[PDB]
Design an enzyme around this catalytic site. Sequence first.
Site, PDB file in Angstrom:
ATOM      1  N   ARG A 197       0.809  -1.215   0.000  1.00  4.23           N
ATOM      2  CA  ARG A 197       0.000   0.000   0.000  1.00  4.23           C
ATOM      3  C   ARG A 197       0.845   1.268   0.000  1.00  4.23           C
ATOM      4  O   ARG A 197       0.599   2.181  -0.787  1.00  4.23           O
ATOM      5  CB  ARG A 197      -0.965   0.003   1.186  1.00  4.23           C
ATOM      6  CG  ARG A 197      -2.052  -1.050   1.088  1.00  4.23           C
ATOM      7  CD  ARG A 197      -2.917  -1.049   2.324  1.00  4.23           C
ATOM      8  NE  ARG A 197      -2.104  -1.081   3.533  1.00  4.23           N
ATOM      9  CZ  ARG A 197      -2.564  -1.410   4.736  1.00  4.23           C
ATOM     10  NH1 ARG A 197      -3.837  -1.746   4.895  1.00  4.23           N
ATOM     11  NH2 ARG A 197      -1.746  -1.411   5.781  1.00  4.23           N
ATOM     12  N   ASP A 264       9.175 -10.781  -0.067  1.00  2.00           N
ATOM     13  CA  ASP A 264      10.062 -11.718  -0.747  1.00  2.00           C
ATOM     14  C   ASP A 264       9.363 -13.043  -1.034  1.00  2.00           C
ATOM     15  O   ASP A 264       9.404 -13.554  -2.150  1.00  2.00           O
ATOM     16  CB  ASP A 264      11.317 -11.975   0.095  1.00  2.00           C
ATOM     17  CG  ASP A 264      12.210 -10.753   0.210  1.00  2.00           C
ATOM     18  OD1 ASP A 264      12.084  -9.835  -0.628  1.00  2.00           O
ATOM     19  OD2 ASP A 264      13.051 -10.716   1.134  1.00  2.00           O
TER      20      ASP A 264
END
Lengths: 308, 308
Positions: A197, A264
């Site tokens: 975001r 990741d």
Amino acid sequence: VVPVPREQLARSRVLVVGDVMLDRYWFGNVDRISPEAPVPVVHVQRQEERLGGAANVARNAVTLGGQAGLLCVVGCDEPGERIVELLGSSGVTPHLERDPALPTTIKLRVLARQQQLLRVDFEAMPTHEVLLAGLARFDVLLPQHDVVLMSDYAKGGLTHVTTMIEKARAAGKAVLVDPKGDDWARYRGASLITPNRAELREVVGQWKSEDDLRARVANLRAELDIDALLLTRSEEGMTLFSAGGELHAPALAREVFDVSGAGDTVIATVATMLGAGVPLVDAVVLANRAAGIVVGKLGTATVDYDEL
Amino acid sequence: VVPVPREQLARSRVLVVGDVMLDRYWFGNVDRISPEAPVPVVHVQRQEERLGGAANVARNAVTLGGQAGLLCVVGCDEPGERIVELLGSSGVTPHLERDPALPTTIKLRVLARQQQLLRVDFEAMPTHEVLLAGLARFDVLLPQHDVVLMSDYAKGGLTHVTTMIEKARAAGKAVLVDPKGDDWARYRGASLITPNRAELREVVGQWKSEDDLRARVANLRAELDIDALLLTRSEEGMTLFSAGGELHAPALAREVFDVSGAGDTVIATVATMLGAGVPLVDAVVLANRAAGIVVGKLGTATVDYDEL
Ligand SMILES: COc1cccc(OC)c1-c1cnnc(NCc2nc3cc(OCC(=O)O)ccc3s2)n1
Ligand SMILES: COc1cccc(OC)c1-c1cnnc(NCc2nc3cc(OCC(=O)O)ccc3s2)n1
Ligand SMILES: O=P(O)(O)OC[C@@H](O)[C@H]1O[C@@H](O)[C@@H](O)[C@@H](O)[C@@H]1O
Ligand SMILES: O=P(O)(O)OC[C@@H](O)[C@H]1O[C@@H](O)[C@@H](O)[C@@H](O)[C@@H]1O
Ligand SMILES: [Cl-]
Ligand SMILES: [Cl-]
Ligand SMILES: [K+]
Ligand SMILES: [K+]
């Protein structure tokens, strides 16, 4: 989502290119103040090491069952040597340029009484020469992988990302980008970008509703030749914005203990799944399941295929 | 004080026994707060290394023109290797026991904007076996030195100081002790102990005058078989309390920038001078001149013979 036979995941070839990191943790005791300054003295009792950045992305790809090559730059130092060792014991096929003038990127956390007192960073910019050398390795590595993953941490390792993306999309190879910073024009032509975001706000501004968000993402993809955007929203889960429609996976984890390697693991999961020739929709779902495990885990972590 | 011919200082053999240290300094920038904790992130730009503890004592002895052997314990690690290297380039003859289970003592300072944020310490206790092995080296080294120096930092390296002092004083070798802690009975039989004001208070309590101090020091020396006591008083200089009378050297330095290695330099200077067969009174004076240079100096430092 039905199981994808381990024999099928094993044929998934993912080329990870980006900024490699070594996460180091010093745990100690604080019984006194320094005699030189009004600061604590930490008597360190134990160390902890994890592969970070693109390295963690790459090792996440192999624990799921997939194959991963790692194209990156390290220094000629002990953290750089540690990364090589850790990559070896984690089945990641290394493709490492070595810059002696470069310090291997290492993120060192110092802790006492189970709280951080400081983070110490060593990092710099790879030379012009070294980066162009890596770009040559890319051309050689590209035909050997089904999908390319760009793990960006603004450490210099992706200075030639634009050319890399062009070369790969010309080769019919799917390209995923984990972004950093707001200048996203460099990421143009990517098959999938995966911001959270906060990262998306600096590019398009705050949305006022789902419609406002849906509209801004739509503009962003057309103006940037990007096919799909995977927005990670923490507590609000994650929402895929593809041309074939949208997909929303609510956050499956209730307790969050440490958020390192979350991003990741997400992009690594999608990549490995895409490399195994599975639908982007199912890839996104499994990426969110993986993200929900990795959060309830101290330090940078990984997930196995069964855990999904 | 008239000059002592460099040929005379060259024959001064000082055996330094004690706790060896590596002082390490990380200088960096702080531009942001960690994403994991309300703590700074230090981006380190440069490192600085100095020999610390007994090692600094020993290297101070050789820069004055004297000879120094160093009997101590290190680990099997990189700081331990660095100490060996630094000892080599500083002319100190090493006599190092190696404990693989021991972490070499290293004092790591972290700085940004010219202030310390934290000190990180690695240290432990040498094994029983290792310490007794060093005690054997002492018996062999003892006839080869004119004077023994005990540099104590309560790191375990001087667990057998009492036996060492007995062996040396029997051999007619002068013994100097730089103290740590309040249990001083272990230091009994020493030719000279060199505490500062703070260290002396925990042993005898606060004095109410010079007479009260003179009296307490007198009791301390008789009850502990110690010949002389050199009290370092910072701004008040330093005062020798020997059997042949007293001596007071006022502080020659007006500006004090860093106080590390001050005590090291003082006891090292006296030792080297005593080893060269020069009077304790002149030794004390020169030790104070050296102390006044070493204070106006960043980090642990040394002085040459001419600077005195
Ligand atoms: C990072 O994830 C969380 C973070 C905070 C609270 C959460 O749930 C209460 C979550 C959470 C818990 N369980 N599942 C998920 N999945 C959706 C995701 N949101 C994010 C957000 C991410 O950004 C982290 C960042 O801001 O740097 C990275 C990965 C994911 S994955 N998120
Ligand atoms: C450590 O020395 C100072 C410390 C503070 C102020 C000072 O003078 C204004 C001095 C100072 C300046 N110039 N000469 C001297 N010589 C007398 C000494 N006092 C001390 C005190 C020491 O103890 C340091 C400690 O407290 O750990 C160690 C060495 C010396 S040498 N001292
Ligand atoms: O703070 P910057 O320099 O941008 O990133 C480094 C850290 O914040 C961490 O990033 C996380 O995602 C992980 O990849 C972890 O390995 C890494 O240490
Ligand atoms: O604080 P503790 O562990 O007792 O001593 C270590 C430090 O405080 C410093 O001591 C000074 O005198 C020096 O010898 C210097 O080398 C050393 O780092
Ligand atoms: Cl690892
Ligand atoms: Cl040095
Ligand atoms: K984690
Ligand atoms: K100093």
